[PDB]
Copies of this chain bind each other. A is one copy, B any other.
Amino acid sequence: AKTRSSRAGLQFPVGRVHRLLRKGNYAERVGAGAPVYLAAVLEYLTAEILELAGNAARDNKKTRIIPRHLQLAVRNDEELNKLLGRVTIAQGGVLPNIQSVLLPKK
């Protein structure tokens, strides 16, 4: 007895995702290949962000990922930024950016 996750060689819970597609009322029938593709996309996406957030945490000499590191990860990456263009990350703050004309002298 192998989990459907391992049959597809995934960490993300295929069984679980299959279940939530049914309980979520998305269509009359859910195909057996739909939660497999979905569990994959979900895993790809979270690896993408965790890779980036990890780097931010290293660039700050920290060992633990905090919400600030997710914020930096998402906002410094053109595509995550857009995917989450309308999302607020609690306790992420903002990117350092000061407009040119606000700086002193010339």
Query: Which one of B25, B26, B27 lies within 8 Å of A28 (CB-CB)?
Result: B25
Give the Cβ gap from A28 to chain B, nearest Cβ, in Å: 7
Looking at A25, A26, A27, A28, which has the most chain B CB atoms within 10 Å of its CB? A25
Main DSSP-derived SS at the A contact region: loop
Give the Cβ gap from A49 to chain B, nearest Cβ, in Å: 29
Chain A: residues with Cβ within 8 Å of the partner, total of 4
Per-residue B-contact encoding for A1-44, CB less than 8 Å = 1, 0 else: 00000000000000000000000011110000000000000000
Complex Cα distance, B28 from A26, in Å, reads 11
Q: What are 4 A-B residue pairs whose CB atoms fall within 8 Å in the complex?
A: A25-B25, A25-B26, A25-B27, A25-B28
